[PDB]
Amino acid sequence: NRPIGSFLFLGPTGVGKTELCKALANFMFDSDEAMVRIDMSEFMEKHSVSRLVGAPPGYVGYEEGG
Amino acid sequence: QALKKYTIDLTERAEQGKLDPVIGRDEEIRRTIQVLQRRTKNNPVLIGEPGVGKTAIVEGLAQRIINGEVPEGLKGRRVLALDMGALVAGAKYRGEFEERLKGVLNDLAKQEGNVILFIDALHTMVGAGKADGAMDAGNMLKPALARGELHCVGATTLDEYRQYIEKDAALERRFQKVFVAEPSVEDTIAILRGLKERYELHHHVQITDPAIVAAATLSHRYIADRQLPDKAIDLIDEAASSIRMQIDSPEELDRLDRRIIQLKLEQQALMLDMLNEELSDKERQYSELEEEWKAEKASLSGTQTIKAELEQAKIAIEQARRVGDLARMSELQYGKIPELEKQLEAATQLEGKTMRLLRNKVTDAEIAEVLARWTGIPVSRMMESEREKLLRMEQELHHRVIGQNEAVDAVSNAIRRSRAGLADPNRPIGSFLFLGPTGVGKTELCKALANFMFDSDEAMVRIDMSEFMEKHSVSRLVGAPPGYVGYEEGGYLTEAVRRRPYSVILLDAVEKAHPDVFNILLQVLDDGRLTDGQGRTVDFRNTVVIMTSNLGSDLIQERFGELDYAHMKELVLGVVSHNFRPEFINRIDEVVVFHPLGEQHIASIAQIQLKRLYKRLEERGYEIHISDEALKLLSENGYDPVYGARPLKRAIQQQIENPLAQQILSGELVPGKVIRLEVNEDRIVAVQH
Amino acid sequence: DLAKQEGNVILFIDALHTMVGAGKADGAMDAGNMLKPALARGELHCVGATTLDEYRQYIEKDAALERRFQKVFVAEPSVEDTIAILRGLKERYELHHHVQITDPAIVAAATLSHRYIADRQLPDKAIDLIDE
Ligand SMILES: Nc1ncnc2c1ncn2[C@@H]1O[C@H](COP(=O)(O)OP(=O)(O)OP(O)(O)=S)[C@@H](O)[C@H]1O
Ligand SMILES: Nc1ncnc2c1ncn2[C@@H]1O[C@H](COP(=O)(O)OP(=O)(O)OP(O)(O)=S)[C@@H](O)[C@H]1O
Ligand SMILES: Nc1ncnc2c1ncn2[C@@H]1O[C@H](COP(=O)(O)OP(=O)(O)OP(O)(O)=S)[C@@H](O)[C@H]1O
């Protein structure tokens, strides 16, 4: 009823958060960025949830999901 | 019957040697042979993003059926290719299409499971014929596909699959998916070796194998729009076309032929002579070069034909492996292969001797050239004009940026590291932070880079980071998210980069934005991907990112005297650490520190501005010389620390241009006559002598 | 018919974004889907010519018929090449409009067209100044 894991990595910069996750994708899929990498520094406004969910019916990018 | 008309065989075209070889792809051909041999739903659809080898897997299934490497259930299965454009094109009357398609289904029922039907573009089939009185062509294959009586094989894209088939679930579950993924780099090299054989046979070259491994790795690095293994085949075949075109015509022939026709026109106009003798010498020279060129053409033709006959021998020995002739095997092998290979290498060393008037084999220099002309990025290995240009970097930036040793050294280093091939290929080239007080050369250092690099000042993606005082910023450079207003148009930074992938990104006056606009740039300067609102990421691993703040104007103008450069860099880095966040100044390549100007710098700036002023008036049709004492007054009247170099600009502007504009519109100073700007008591006079 | 010509015909489809959604009737074969298995086998030698924003709108919407084609980026020419183009078309327009054009008129048209008109792009606005 859940995903496999859901980790909240913390810690000051340049100690290997993002390369740990790229290390996981390099292990698991034999490729560094073969993974769904969402930048959570684009979503600084409330109306940009809909980049990942998609568009509600009768709007612009309704044909194209999230 | 109907299968004569509306279908094309593929096992003929794998039997006659018209299809390209298919190398790799173990798991997908085994899974396609699993899904074709069921009782219900004999319908694999091959789904992958376009060009990763989907139609090539049906090519590989045709070739494995003909060679007989398959399990015994498929041995004898014809692979008929259907094309919808041959079905529809006659059906003018009502029900002609339904008659044709029912005829195809009955002539496949009369085969008893023998024919694997190949629809390419399965996404097209849904709704082919929908009209007033119609059957939509999905409502005539839903019964026949439902019972497994048809062995259809689908070949569609992924986004065409979201658009066209999963809008229609009743024909979505008739088909089983086979997810064809993007192939890896090493398998790409394997595919390129098989097609190295094929493309050397077509375009009359020799493709060396380091060109292939460079083409795979460099295509995977630079071209980020398309998908492998197709971008590598693009670089290979376009390099082969380049080599064949350079074989087809030299350039010394151009120079000598234009020379002899020019001297022929001159000699016939003069009819002292000497030009009969010179023209006869040039005609003998041109005939020598023409005969040597024809010798090279004949040698390369013989070598390519003998390579083609070698591959004819390989085709014949595989025909003998399928048929089983006895003396033909050892005959073809031990006769044909080693003697034609050793005389092929004799022709190879002969061409290595005789090709003078050159490049005759597709090697990695040509892959570098085709990939530099594809994208925009300076991939290629340098020429000597560009390399001596590229070591006069600090020279050719002090033609426009006098002053400022430090940052011209730093940015010279960054562009040199990108050109040698030592940059981190996961980050952009230069992610700089020009600091320093008001008007000391920053925006002109960046314009100096654009005039150096692109030979234009107005070719630099210049975000203006003082319009960005609210988070409307973010929404105006990464585009409008779906549902919202400008989703059809996209951002400015992402589109204006993805046009020219190698471009200076100048973020002018970067502290004037809201402090959380430095969070798009976390993504940029960390990895060089920037996902805009239409959804697709944009490769910023080829830019030069320059942000020109002035956060430390008080500190730098206070303390640039009596301190070295290192302590000043550390101290203004402390000030910047108070203004930015620690997540972001970590990302920067090198924070430089500019400095206030001294008087000799101001005098040199004055000479540069008077160069462009003389350029303006020579475009107008005048000439001006100046006295050195006038330059001394412009130097002494344009010194102040707090404002830098624009006091010189408006002092020049006033104390030269305004009385000169008084006098040019006076009808006084006649053009053509030399203007001297000698001093007055304090002003500058202009005379006519 | 073009396959019968044995590759002796280079096709030329200006406004390729017209071709992409061309004959798209009520769910039938447009021009894109019928040409799409004959482009990437080389049996047709099309040459497109498209505006750039039409490319991003109408061709990169449809990724297959995108990757059959090669982008050949044609940048705006510089001022001096514009001067050369204007010299050849000075010959042509002096044939047409019964008048004579001098070299200062050409270099003035190129410089003032690039510096002042901000909407259209070179070499076109230079030729519009000359023709008008
Ligand atoms: N523990 C580590 N082992 C190896 N490389 C590391 C390590 N930490 C950082 N790096 C290098 O630093 C970069 C990755 O930095 P990150 O730690 O991923 O930055 P971060 O984790 O996102 O923290 P922030 O949010 O960026 S400040 C890559 O260039 C890595 O090579
Ligand atoms: N694994 C492979 N083995 C052999 N050739 C390959 C392979 N992958 C790609 N190719 C070549 O790639 C070219 C076209 O690839 P295709 O599979 O035809 O792309 P595609 O399947 O048509 O994708 P779409 O969606 O139909 S455009 C041909 O020249 C093939 O020879
Ligand atoms: N070393 C230099 N060589 C030539 N011109 C210089 C030099 N230093 C400054 N300048 C002149 O200084 C003028 C103003 O500099 P700009 O770069 O335009 O201002 P800025 O550097 O952006 O600083 P601010 O804070 O943005 S006003 C430019 O027009 C240059 O002509």
Side-chain angles (χ1 to χ4, degrees), chain B residues 457-493:
Chain B
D457 287 333
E458 298 88 2
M460 53 192 299
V461 176
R462 183 167 174 176
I463 308 164
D464 275 332
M465 294 286 289
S466 67
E467 302 177 354
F468 284 4
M469 294 186 286
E470 302 294 328
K471 303 169 69 64
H472 304 89
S473 66
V474 180
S475 289
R476 63 188 287 163
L477 62 81
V478 304
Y484 288 87
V485 194
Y487 180 83
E488 289 176 347
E489 296 181 358
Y492 180 67
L493 178 58

Short mmCIF file of all heavy atoms in Angstrom, two decimals, chain B residues 457-493:
data_model
loop_
_atom_site.label_atom_id
_atom_site.label_comp_id
_atom_site.label_asym_id
_atom_site.label_seq_id
_atom_site.Cartn_x
_atom_site.Cartn_y
_atom_site.Cartn_z
N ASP B 457 28.05 41.54 -30.69
CA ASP B 457 27.71 41.86 -29.31
C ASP B 457 26.28 41.48 -28.96
O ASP B 457 26.00 41.15 -27.81
CB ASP B 457 27.89 43.34 -29.03
CG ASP B 457 29.34 43.73 -28.94
OD1 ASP B 457 30.15 42.86 -28.59
OD2 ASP B 457 29.66 44.90 -29.21
N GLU B 458 25.37 41.55 -29.92
CA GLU B 458 23.98 41.25 -29.63
C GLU B 458 23.66 39.79 -29.91
O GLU B 458 22.64 39.47 -30.51
CB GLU B 458 23.07 42.16 -30.44
CG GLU B 458 23.20 43.65 -30.17
CD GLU B 458 24.27 44.32 -31.02
OE1 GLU B 458 24.89 43.62 -31.85
OE2 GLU B 458 24.49 45.54 -30.87
N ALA B 459 24.53 38.89 -29.47
CA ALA B 459 24.25 37.46 -29.52
C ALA B 459 24.65 36.91 -28.16
O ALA B 459 25.69 36.28 -28.01
CB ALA B 459 24.98 36.78 -30.66
N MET B 460 23.77 37.10 -27.20
CA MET B 460 23.99 36.65 -25.84
C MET B 460 22.64 36.63 -25.16
O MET B 460 21.93 37.63 -25.18
CB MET B 460 25.01 37.54 -25.14
CG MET B 460 24.74 39.01 -25.14
SD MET B 460 26.23 39.82 -24.59
CE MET B 460 26.38 39.11 -22.96
N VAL B 461 22.25 35.47 -24.66
CA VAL B 461 20.94 35.36 -24.05
C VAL B 461 21.03 36.14 -22.76
O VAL B 461 21.68 35.71 -21.81
CB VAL B 461 20.53 33.90 -23.81
CG1 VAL B 461 19.22 33.87 -23.10
CG2 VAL B 461 20.42 33.19 -25.12
N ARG B 462 20.45 37.32 -22.77
CA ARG B 462 20.65 38.28 -21.70
C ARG B 462 19.34 38.42 -20.94
O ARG B 462 18.46 39.19 -21.31
CB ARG B 462 21.12 39.59 -22.24
CG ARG B 462 21.40 40.56 -21.17
CD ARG B 462 22.15 41.71 -21.68
NE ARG B 462 22.25 42.68 -20.62
CZ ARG B 462 22.94 43.80 -20.72
NH1 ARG B 462 23.57 44.08 -21.84
NH2 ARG B 462 22.98 44.65 -19.71
N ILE B 463 19.19 37.60 -19.90
CA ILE B 463 18.17 37.85 -18.90
C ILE B 463 18.52 39.15 -18.21
O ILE B 463 19.69 39.47 -18.04
CB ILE B 463 18.13 36.69 -17.91
CG1 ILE B 463 18.01 35.39 -18.65
CG2 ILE B 463 16.95 36.79 -17.00
CD1 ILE B 463 18.33 34.28 -17.77
N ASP B 464 17.52 39.92 -17.85
CA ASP B 464 17.73 41.17 -17.14
C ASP B 464 17.17 41.03 -15.74
O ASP B 464 16.00 41.30 -15.50
CB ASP B 464 17.09 42.32 -17.90
CG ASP B 464 17.97 42.88 -18.98
OD1 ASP B 464 19.21 42.78 -18.85
OD2 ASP B 464 17.43 43.44 -19.95
N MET B 465 18.02 40.67 -14.79
CA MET B 465 17.59 40.27 -13.46
C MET B 465 17.23 41.43 -12.57
O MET B 465 17.28 41.27 -11.36
CB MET B 465 18.68 39.46 -12.77
CG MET B 465 18.99 38.13 -13.38
SD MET B 465 17.78 36.85 -13.10
CE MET B 465 18.03 36.55 -11.36
N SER B 466 16.89 42.60 -13.10
CA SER B 466 16.30 43.63 -12.27
C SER B 466 14.84 43.86 -12.63
O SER B 466 14.22 44.79 -12.12
CB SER B 466 17.09 44.93 -12.37
OG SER B 466 17.00 45.50 -13.65
N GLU B 467 14.30 43.06 -13.53
CA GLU B 467 12.87 43.00 -13.74
C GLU B 467 12.23 41.96 -12.86
O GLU B 467 11.01 41.79 -12.92
CB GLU B 467 12.57 42.62 -15.17
CG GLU B 467 13.14 43.52 -16.17
CD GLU B 467 12.85 43.03 -17.54
OE1 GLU B 467 12.31 41.91 -17.64
OE2 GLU B 467 13.15 43.75 -18.50
N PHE B 468 13.02 41.25 -12.10
CA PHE B 468 12.59 40.01 -11.47
C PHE B 468 12.35 40.20 -9.99
O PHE B 468 12.75 39.37 -9.18
CB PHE B 468 13.61 38.91 -11.67
CG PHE B 468 13.61 38.31 -13.02
CD1 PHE B 468 12.81 38.78 -14.03
CD2 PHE B 468 14.33 37.19 -13.25
CE1 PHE B 468 12.83 38.20 -15.25
CE2 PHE B 468 14.33 36.62 -14.46
CZ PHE B 468 13.58 37.12 -15.46
N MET B 469 11.74 41.30 -9.61
CA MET B 469 11.66 41.61 -8.21
C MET B 469 10.59 40.82 -7.48
O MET B 469 10.52 40.90 -6.25
CB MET B 469 11.46 43.10 -8.03
CG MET B 469 12.66 43.87 -8.49
SD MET B 469 12.57 45.62 -8.16
CE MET B 469 11.40 46.09 -9.40
N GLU B 470 9.75 40.05 -8.18
CA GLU B 470 8.83 39.11 -7.54
C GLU B 470 8.95 37.79 -8.28
O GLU B 470 9.58 37.70 -9.34
CB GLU B 470 7.41 39.69 -7.53
CG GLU B 470 7.23 41.05 -6.84
CD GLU B 470 7.48 41.00 -5.35
OE1 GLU B 470 7.19 39.95 -4.73
OE2 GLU B 470 7.95 42.01 -4.78
N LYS B 471 8.28 36.73 -7.80
CA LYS B 471 8.48 35.36 -8.27
C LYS B 471 7.81 35.07 -9.61
O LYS B 471 8.03 34.01 -10.24
CB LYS B 471 7.97 34.43 -7.18
CG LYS B 471 8.72 34.73 -5.90
CD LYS B 471 8.12 34.06 -4.71
CE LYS B 471 8.32 32.58 -4.80
NZ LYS B 471 9.76 32.25 -4.76
N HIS B 472 7.06 36.06 -10.08
CA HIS B 472 6.75 36.25 -11.49
C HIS B 472 7.96 36.07 -12.40
O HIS B 472 7.80 35.68 -13.56
CB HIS B 472 6.19 37.64 -11.63
CG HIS B 472 5.01 37.90 -10.76
ND1 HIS B 472 5.12 38.37 -9.48
CD2 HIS B 472 3.69 37.74 -10.99
CE1 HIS B 472 3.93 38.51 -8.95
NE2 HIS B 472 3.04 38.13 -9.84
N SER B 473 9.15 36.39 -11.91
CA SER B 473 10.43 35.96 -12.47
C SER B 473 10.49 34.52 -12.95
O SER B 473 10.80 34.23 -14.12
CB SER B 473 11.47 36.08 -11.38
OG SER B 473 11.16 35.14 -10.37
N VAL B 474 10.33 33.62 -11.99
CA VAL B 474 10.35 32.20 -12.25
C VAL B 474 9.34 31.87 -13.32
O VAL B 474 9.67 31.24 -14.33
CB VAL B 474 10.05 31.45 -10.94
CG1 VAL B 474 10.06 29.97 -11.17
CG2 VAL B 474 11.04 31.86 -9.90
N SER B 475 8.15 32.45 -13.20
CA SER B 475 7.16 32.13 -14.22
C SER B 475 7.45 32.80 -15.56
O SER B 475 6.84 32.43 -16.56
CB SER B 475 5.77 32.48 -13.73
OG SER B 475 5.37 31.58 -12.72
N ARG B 476 8.37 33.75 -15.62
CA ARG B 476 8.62 34.34 -16.92
C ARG B 476 9.88 33.85 -17.58
O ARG B 476 10.11 34.21 -18.74
CB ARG B 476 8.65 35.86 -16.87
CG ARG B 476 9.71 36.49 -16.06
CD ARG B 476 9.44 37.95 -16.01
NE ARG B 476 9.73 38.55 -17.29
CZ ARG B 476 9.29 39.75 -17.63
NH1 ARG B 476 8.54 40.43 -16.80
NH2 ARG B 476 9.61 40.24 -18.80
N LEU B 477 10.70 33.07 -16.90
CA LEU B 477 11.78 32.44 -17.64
C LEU B 477 11.67 30.93 -17.79
O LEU B 477 12.39 30.38 -18.61
CB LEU B 477 13.16 32.80 -17.07
CG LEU B 477 13.78 32.54 -15.71
CD1 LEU B 477 14.32 31.18 -15.62
CD2 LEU B 477 14.95 33.40 -15.62
N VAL B 478 10.80 30.23 -17.05
CA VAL B 478 10.64 28.81 -17.35
C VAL B 478 9.29 28.50 -18.00
O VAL B 478 8.94 27.33 -18.12
CB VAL B 478 10.85 27.92 -16.12
CG1 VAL B 478 12.18 28.16 -15.51
CG2 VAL B 478 9.77 28.10 -15.10
N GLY B 479 8.55 29.49 -18.43
CA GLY B 479 7.32 29.23 -19.16
C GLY B 479 6.13 29.00 -18.26
O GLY B 479 6.23 28.87 -17.04
N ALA B 480 5.00 28.93 -18.88
CA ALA B 480 3.74 28.90 -18.18
C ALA B 480 3.26 27.48 -18.03
O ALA B 480 3.07 26.80 -19.04
CB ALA B 480 2.70 29.71 -18.94
N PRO B 481 2.99 27.04 -16.81
CA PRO B 481 2.65 25.64 -16.53
C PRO B 481 1.30 25.27 -17.12
O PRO B 481 0.54 26.18 -17.46
CB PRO B 481 2.63 25.61 -15.00
CG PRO B 481 2.38 26.94 -14.63
CD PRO B 481 3.04 27.83 -15.58
N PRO B 482 0.98 23.98 -17.28
CA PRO B 482 -0.21 23.60 -18.04
C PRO B 482 -1.52 24.04 -17.42
O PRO B 482 -1.68 24.13 -16.21
CB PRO B 482 -0.13 22.08 -18.07
CG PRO B 482 1.22 21.78 -17.85
CD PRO B 482 1.74 22.78 -16.92
N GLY B 483 -2.48 24.30 -18.30
CA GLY B 483 -3.71 24.94 -17.94
C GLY B 483 -3.66 26.45 -17.98
O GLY B 483 -4.69 27.09 -18.13
N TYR B 484 -2.49 27.03 -17.85
CA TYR B 484 -2.40 28.45 -17.67
C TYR B 484 -2.10 29.13 -18.99
O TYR B 484 -2.21 28.52 -20.05
CB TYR B 484 -1.37 28.73 -16.59
CG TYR B 484 -1.88 28.37 -15.24
CD1 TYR B 484 -1.74 27.09 -14.75
CD2 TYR B 484 -2.56 29.28 -14.48
CE1 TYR B 484 -2.22 26.76 -13.53
CE2 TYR B 484 -3.02 28.95 -13.26
CZ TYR B 484 -2.86 27.68 -12.80
OH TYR B 484 -3.33 27.33 -11.57
N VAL B 485 -1.71 30.40 -18.93
CA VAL B 485 -2.03 31.33 -20.01
C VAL B 485 -1.13 31.13 -21.21
O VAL B 485 -1.59 31.10 -22.36
CB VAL B 485 -1.91 32.77 -19.51
CG1 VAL B 485 -2.55 33.68 -20.50
CG2 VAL B 485 -2.52 32.91 -18.17
N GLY B 486 0.17 31.07 -20.99
CA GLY B 486 1.09 31.04 -22.11
C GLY B 486 1.77 29.71 -22.31
O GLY B 486 2.94 29.66 -22.68
N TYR B 487 1.03 28.63 -22.07
CA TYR B 487 1.55 27.29 -22.26
C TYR B 487 1.91 27.03 -23.71
O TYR B 487 2.79 26.22 -23.99
CB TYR B 487 0.51 26.29 -21.80
CG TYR B 487 0.90 24.86 -21.92
CD1 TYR B 487 1.67 24.26 -20.95
CD2 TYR B 487 0.52 24.11 -23.02
CE1 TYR B 487 2.04 22.97 -21.07
CE2 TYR B 487 0.89 22.82 -23.15
CZ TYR B 487 1.64 22.25 -22.17
OH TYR B 487 2.01 20.94 -22.29
N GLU B 488 1.27 27.71 -24.64
CA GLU B 488 1.60 27.53 -26.04
C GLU B 488 2.89 28.21 -26.46
O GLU B 488 3.31 28.03 -27.61
CB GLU B 488 0.46 28.05 -26.90
CG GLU B 488 -0.78 27.22 -26.84
CD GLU B 488 -1.91 27.84 -27.63
OE1 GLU B 488 -1.78 29.02 -28.00
OE2 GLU B 488 -2.91 27.14 -27.91
N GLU B 489 3.53 28.98 -25.59
CA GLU B 489 4.64 29.81 -26.01
C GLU B 489 5.93 29.51 -25.29
O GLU B 489 7.00 29.71 -25.87
CB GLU B 489 4.31 31.29 -25.83
CG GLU B 489 3.17 31.74 -26.72
CD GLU B 489 2.84 33.21 -26.57
OE1 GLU B 489 3.48 33.89 -25.75
OE2 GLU B 489 1.92 33.69 -27.28
N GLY B 490 5.88 29.04 -24.07
CA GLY B 490 7.09 28.67 -23.38
C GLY B 490 7.83 29.87 -22.84
O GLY B 490 7.45 31.03 -23.03
N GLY B 491 8.92 29.58 -22.15
CA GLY B 491 9.69 30.60 -21.46
C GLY B 491 10.56 31.41 -22.39
O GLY B 491 10.44 31.36 -23.61
N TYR B 492 11.44 32.18 -21.79
CA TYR B 492 12.43 32.89 -22.57
C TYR B 492 13.81 32.28 -22.46
O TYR B 492 14.49 32.13 -23.48
CB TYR B 492 12.51 34.35 -22.17
CG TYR B 492 13.53 35.06 -22.98
CD1 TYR B 492 13.35 35.24 -24.33
CD2 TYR B 492 14.68 35.57 -22.40
CE1 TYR B 492 14.29 35.89 -25.09
CE2 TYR B 492 15.62 36.22 -23.15
CZ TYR B 492 15.42 36.38 -24.50
OH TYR B 492 16.35 37.04 -25.27
N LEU B 493 14.23 31.91 -21.25
CA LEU B 493 15.56 31.34 -21.09
C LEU B 493 15.65 29.97 -21.73
O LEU B 493 16.62 29.69 -22.44
CB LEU B 493 15.91 31.25 -19.62
CG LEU B 493 17.24 30.62 -19.34
CD1 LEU B 493 18.30 31.41 -20.04
CD2 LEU B 493 17.47 30.65 -17.86
#
